[PDB]
Amino acid sequence: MTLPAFKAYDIRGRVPDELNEDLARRIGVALAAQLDQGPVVLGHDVRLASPALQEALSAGLRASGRDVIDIGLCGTEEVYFQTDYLKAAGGVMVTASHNPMDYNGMKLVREQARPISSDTGLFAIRDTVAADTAAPGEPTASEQSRTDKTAYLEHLLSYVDRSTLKPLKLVVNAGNGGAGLIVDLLAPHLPFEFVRVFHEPDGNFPNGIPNPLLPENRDATAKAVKDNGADFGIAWDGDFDRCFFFDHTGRFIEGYYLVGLLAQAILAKQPGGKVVHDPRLTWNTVEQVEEAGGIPVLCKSGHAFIKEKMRSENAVYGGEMSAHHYFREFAYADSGMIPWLLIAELVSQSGRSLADLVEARMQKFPCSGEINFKVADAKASVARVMEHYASLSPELDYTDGISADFGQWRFNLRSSNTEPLLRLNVETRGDAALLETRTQEISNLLRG
Ligand SMILES: O=P(O)(O)O[C@H]1O[C@H](CO)[C@@H](O)[C@H](O)[C@H]1O
Numbered sequence: 001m002t003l004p005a006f007k008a009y010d011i012r013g014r015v016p017d018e019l020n021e022d023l024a025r026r027i028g029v030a031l032a033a034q035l036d037q038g039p040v041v042l043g044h045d046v047r048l049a050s051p052a053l054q055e056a057l058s059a060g061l062r063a064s065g066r067d068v069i070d071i072g073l074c075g076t077e078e079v080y081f082q083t084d085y086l087k088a089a090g091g092v093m094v095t096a097s098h099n100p101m102d103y104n105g106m107k108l109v110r111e112q113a114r115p116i117s118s119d120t121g122l123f124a125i126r127d128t129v130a131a132d133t134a135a136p137g138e139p140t141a142s143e144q145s146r147t148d149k150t151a152y153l154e155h156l157l158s159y160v161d162r163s164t165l166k167p168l169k170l171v172v173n174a175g176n177g178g179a180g181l182i183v184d185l186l187a188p189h190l191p192f193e194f195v196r197v198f199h200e201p202d203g204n205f206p207n208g209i210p211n212p213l214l215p216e217n218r219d220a221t222a223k224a225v226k227d228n229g230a231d232f233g234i235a236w237d238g239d240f241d242r243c244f245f246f247d248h249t250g251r252f253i254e255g256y257y258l259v260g261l262l263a264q265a266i267l268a269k270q271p272g273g274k275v276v277h278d279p280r281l282t283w284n285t286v287e288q289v290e291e292a293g294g295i296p297v298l299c300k301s302g303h304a305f306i307k308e309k310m311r312s313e314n315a316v317y318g319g320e321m322s323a324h325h326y327f328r329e330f331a332y333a334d335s336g337m338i339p340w341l342l343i344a345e346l347v348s349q350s351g352r353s354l355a356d357l358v359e360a361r362m363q364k365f366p367c368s369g370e371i372n373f374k375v376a377d378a379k380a381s382v383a384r385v386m387e388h389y390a391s392l393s394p395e396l397d398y399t400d401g402i403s404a405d406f407g408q409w410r411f412n413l414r415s416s417n418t419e420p421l422l423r424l425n426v427e428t429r430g431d432a433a434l435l436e437t438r439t440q441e442i443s444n445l446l447r448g
Pocket residue numbers: 009301302303304320322324415416417418419423
């Protein structure tokens with residue numbers, strides 16, 4: 001077979017049978033052979049096993065003559081930022097995301113933090129590692145510890161005009177991941193009053209593995225917002241490249257609406273820019289981007305496709321409905337920090353609540369939310385859906401699965417690249433009833 005831990009976009013698997021220090025060392029050796037010239041940035045998340053996996057990566061890299069820049073315990077976006085900022089040859093983030101306790105993984109980038117994915121180096125690394133029975137060499141290069149976050153923090157703060165910020169009360173929920181470290185470093189530079197929930201990093205995860213999409217985790221942020229009269233709340237996943245917003249009523253804001261909201265925020269600073277978005281949910285983004293004077297650019301979902309489209313378009317911002325937000329000046333990479341700074345600035349400057357900023361958009365373009373299906377035969381199920389709707393002659397687009405635009409409603413139906421799942425998204429033109437009847441109709445067909 002092949003090593004299961006090597007996935008489409010990253011490495012992830014159970015420790016130690018799918019991922020271990022031996023494999024991590026071999027990955028470091030193989031990565032050295034795939035990169036252009038330069039040092040390699042290494043960082044890791046709060047999981048208990050992550051430092052030892054990083055140390056093994058460093059040992060293999062240095063055995064291959066790569067200088068290593070250890071940026072320590074960090075968020076995934078810090079590996080991206082420092083890889084680009086320090087003009088490194090590449091970088092690796094050791095992170096398990098929201099996988100179980102016995103799991104870990106790696107996210108790999110080359111120069112300018114460009115993703116390394118299955119077809120752009122990751123399976124080449126896998127195949128090298130799979131066949132590597134060489135004895136480990138000894139280090140011929142050095143490791144340097146670079147824990148200075150000054151340039152990173154300055155970069156984050158550059159997205160807002162600090163003199164215009166108001167002393168909003170913000171709930172922040174790190175989920176015992178790593179986000180609180182950065183919040184606390186930003187706080188002396190910000191006027192906000194923070195209400196800190198599950199703030200301390202703890203790889204034992206006493207309050208659950210960080211995942212704000214799970215309703216019981218969602219409710220912890222909502223409750224803190226409501227009980228403290230906070231202006232809004234922010235929660236992160238463990239490596240905080242994803243952020244999740246709760247308005248002052250405690251309501252979780254579906255990520256679709258943040259794409260248009262952030263696009264308008266960015267377009268105020270970079271007028272006429274292009275904005276990349278995915279095909280799952282589109283109408284609101286296209287309208288908000290165009291209204292703000294930007295140009296929307298449709299792109300298949302998946303961070304590697306988004307980033308490569310942003311680069312070829314010089315796009316100022318890209319956003320996915322799945323809580324991923326990419327910024328041109330941030331090495332075209334995603335950050336879980338820039339978005340809430342931008343939203344705090346928008347609330348401060350406009351005098352409008354986060355709820356108000358999105359309310360009419362969510363009424364105008366209601367969406368189903370992403371609904372996932374594990375079916376016996378994905379291809380046959382998609383065909384049942386398309387045959388059912390054939391007599392209505394929808395406009396079809398195959399950018400990313402199937403998008404079908406019926407006029408007053410549309411859907412996107414695609415296979416996941418990271419799980420053996422079918423993913424459904426439906427939206428309508430201001431019609432909640434049509435949204436529900438079509439969502440249920442499609443669901444019945446998929447399950448038939
Ligand atoms: O499983 P999917 O849907 O192919 O991909 C999922 O993981 C990718 C990497 O995190 C994201 O960029 C996608 O937006 C998300 O939907």
